[PDB]
Amino acid sequence: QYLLPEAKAQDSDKICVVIDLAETLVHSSFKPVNNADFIIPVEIDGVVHQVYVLKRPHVDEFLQRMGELFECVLFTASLAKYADPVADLLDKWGAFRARLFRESCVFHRGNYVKDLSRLGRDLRRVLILDNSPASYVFHPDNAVPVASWFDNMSDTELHDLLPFFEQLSRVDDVYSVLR
Ligand SMILES: [Mg+2]
């Protein structure tokens, strides 16, 4: 059983992009943040704790355009109860066609690895966007590196990566670009 169902008609000819959440698109903290973008109540051992979420600059534009260009899949190492409510608030456009969480990762040598072979998509047409090189150790030639983001509001990395993804969305084989 693959991680994804069969691609829907509106997605099957597009490249599939696996997108990480934490430190890629947003940064979440248990420490109080003034002027947070979202605050999500998360229950741990029956006690509610407020999680403070900041959005990376240019993420709305980035997520909107990627949802058009690609079959977008949220693939996080975190548990659904962190990731789900954040995605709900973030994905205004139905960009994420599927959500995969901690259970879907392989724990390999102390790292959560996102194993692209389990997806059920032709790997010539799969990309991964993740701030942790560790998550794509099995598929390093499918990857578009992005720097870890915490709270730097001068960051332009999501914006500067768009022309590149614009190009990748049109190719037949991602490996002809990434090697
Ligand atoms: Mg991350």
From Swiss-Prot:
Catalytic-site annotation from UniProt: 20, 22
Annotated FCP1 homology domain residues: 10-168
Enzyme Commission numbers on file: 3.1.3.16
GO molecular function ontology, one term from the record: RNA polymerase II CTD heptapeptide repeat phosphatase activity
Cellular component aspect of the GO annotation: extracellular exosome; nucleoplasm; nucleus
Residue sites binding Mg(2+) per the record: 20, 22, 131
Activity regulation, short description: Stimulated by GTF2F1. Inhibited by beryllofluoride anions.
Tissue occurrence: Expression is restricted to non-neuronal tissues. Highest expression in skeletal muscle, spleen, lung and placenta.
Keyword Cell membrane: no
GO biological process: negative regulation of G1/S transition of mitotic cell cycle; negative regulation of neurogenesis; negative regulation of neuron differentiation; protein dephosphorylation; regulation of transcription by RNA polymerase II
pH dependence statement: Optimum pH is 5.
Annotated site residues (Transition state stabilizer) in this chain: 76, 114
Keyword entries, A-Z: Acetylation, Hydrolase, Magnesium, Metal-binding, Nucleus, Protein phosphatase
Reactions catalysed according to its record: O-phospho-L-seryl-[protein] + H2O = L-seryl-[protein] + phosphate; O-phospho-L-threonyl-[protein] + H2O = L-threonyl-[protein] + phosphate
Co-factor requirement: Mg(2+)
Cofactor note: Binds 1 Mg(2+) ion per monomer.
Function: Preferentially catalyzes the dephosphorylation of 'Ser-5' within the tandem 7 residue repeats in the C-terminal domain (CTD) of the largest RNA polymerase II subunit POLR2A. Negatively regulates RNA polymerase II transcription, possibly by controlling the transition from initiation/capping to processive transcript elongation. Recruited by REST to neuronal genes that contain RE-1 elements, leading to neuronal gene silencing in non-neuronal cells.
Assembly, per entry: Monomer. Interacts with GTF2F1. Interacts with REST.
Identification of the protein by name: Carboxy-terminal domain RNA polymerase II polypeptide A small phosphatase 1
Biological source species: Homo sapiens (Human)
Residues shown, of full length: 77 to 255 of 261
